[PDB]
Amino acid sequence: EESINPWILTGFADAEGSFLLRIRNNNKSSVGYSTELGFQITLHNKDKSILENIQSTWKVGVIANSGDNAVSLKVTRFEDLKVIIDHFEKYPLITQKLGDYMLFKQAFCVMENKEHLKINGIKELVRIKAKLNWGLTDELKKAFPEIISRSLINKNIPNFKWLAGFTSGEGCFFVNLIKSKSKLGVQVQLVFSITQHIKDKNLMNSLITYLGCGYIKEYNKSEFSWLAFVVTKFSDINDKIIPVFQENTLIGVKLEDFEDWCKVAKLIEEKKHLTESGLDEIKKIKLNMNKGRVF
DNA sequence: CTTTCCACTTATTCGACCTTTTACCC
DNA sequence: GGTAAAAGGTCGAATAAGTGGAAAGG
C-alpha cells in the first residue's frame, strides 16, 4: 500500500469525495430519529487500489462492494471523522464541495456534543442537511416543514499536487483521430480536458492562467450545464501539460492513460504521426486506452 | 438504545468520444 | 497542395449521493 500526497488527496476529494448525513426514522430511538455522519468515495472496481491507498493514508474507513461493478470507501465511525476534519482543515477543498464540507463540519460539532440525542439537535441536523448535497428527502420534507432556508465558494488552485488529484477524477487524456480525404486520411490530435459543473466557472477559468494554456468550452444543456477546460495546441501539451503530470503524479488507471498519451506525444514530436507506420502504432495505443483498456 | 457496518440502489455528471470548421504551413 | 487548432456537440455508464437492513457494542 502506498501513501497519497495530502494535496493530491484533497484534489481527488474535490473531484469525487462525497459527504453524508443520514437522518433516519427509527422507532428504537428515544428521539424518533437516528443519525449517521460520514465521508465516502465510490468508483469502478478497476480503481479499488485508490480506495485502499486512501484507507492506508488516513488509517480510517471501510471498503465494500457497491454492486457488481463498483466499490466504496466509507468513513462513518465518529471518532475517525476527526482524521477527516484534521486533513481538510490543513489542506482545504477549493470547489463548491467546500460548502458541503462546511456543513459536514457543522454536523460533526452537533453530534460531538451528543445534541443529536434530543429533538432540538435533530432539528439542527435537519437544517444543516437541508443545504447539504441534494438536501432534505421527501419524508424529512414532511416532518419538518418549517425548514426551507447557498453562497458561492471562490478559491484559488493552491499548487499542482491539488491539480493532479482533481485531474485524476475530472480529467481526460485523449487521442483524437481527425478523419478526412487526405492520402494519409487522418490528423492525429492530442487533447487534454478537465470537465466540471458551470457553478465553478471561476476555478475553471483560472486553469488557463494557472497552466498557461488552453481554453474553455461551455455546455448549456437540458440535462446539465458544465465547462471543459481544453488544451489542443501540441506545444502546450508537450511543454506544459506533460511536465506537470510528470512531476505531480496521477492516481488510478488514468495514470496509465496519461502514460500512453505521452507515448503518442513522443511519436508526434518525431513527426512519425505523418507516416503510415507511426500512425498504425498510434491507433494501436489509442485502441487500448480509456474505455478500451482491459483489466 | 445507539453506533457501525455491509449489501445494494438511484440518477447524476458529464469523460470520452467523434465530426466539422477554422487557422496556418510548405 | 499539405497539417494543426479549435469548435461543435453526443451519450452510456462510472460516478456522487443515497437507502434498507441488521449486527455490533456501550
Ordered DSSP codes for A235-288? HHIIIIIHHHHHHS---STHHHHHHHHHHHHHHHHTTGGGSHHHHHHHHHHHHT
Q: Can you tell me which residue has its alpha carbon closest to the C1' of nucleotide C3?
A: A187
* Four-residue CA torsion sign, A197, A60, A105, A134: positive
Protein CA at A35 to nucleotide C1' at B2, angstroms: 9
Determine whether the distance from the CB of A179 to the nearest atom of strand B is below 7 Å. yes
Strand C, nucleotides covered by protein (CB < 7 Å): 2-10, 12-19
The answer to whether the beta carbons of residues A137 and A126 sit under 8 Å apart is: no
Q: Map residue A86 onto helix, strand or coil.
A: helix
In three state form, how does the secondary structure of A113-169 look?
Answer: CCHHHCHHHHHHHHHHHHCCCCCCCCCHHHHCCCCCCCCCCCCCCCCHHHHHHHHHH
Query: Which residues make Cβ contacts (< 8 Å) with residue A243, sequence separation at least 6?
Result: none
Contact A71, A45 (CB under 8 A): yes
Sequence-distant (6+) residues with CB within 8 A of A74 are A38, A39, A40, A61, A62, A63, A64
Eight-class DSSP state of A213: -
Q: In chain A, where are the structural domains located?
A: 1-141, 149-295
| C-alpha cell at position A218 | 461551455
Spatial separation of the C-alpha atoms in residues A124 and A161, rounded to whole Å: 36
Q: Provide CATH code, domain A1-141.
A: 3.10.28.10
Residues 135-174 of A with CB under 7 A from strand B: 169-174
How many Å apart are CA A19 and CA A132, to the nearest integer?
A: 8
> Nearest protein residue to C8's C1' (by CA)?
A217
Do the Cβ atoms of A279 and A188 come closer than 8 Å? yes
Task: Round to a whole number and report the distance in Å from the CA of A164 to the C1' of C2.
Answer: 37
Q: Using alpha carbons, select from A136, A114, A118 the residue that is nearest to residue A23.
A: A136
In 3D space, the residue among A272, A268, A267, A275 whose CA is nearest the CA of residue A184 turns out to be A275
Q: Measuring CA to CA, which residue among A261, A51, A245, A58 is closest to residue A167?
A: A245
Tell me the C-alpha distance between A157 and A239, whole Å: 20
Taking the C-alpha atoms of residue A55 and residue A75, their distance in angstroms, rounded to an integer, is 9
Q: In chain A, count of helices (H) and strands (E)? A: 12, 8
Is the CB of residue A229 less than 8 Å from the CB of residue A204?
yes
Closest residue (Cα, C1') to B9 = A67
CA-CA distance, A251 to A57, in Å (whole number)? Answer: 14
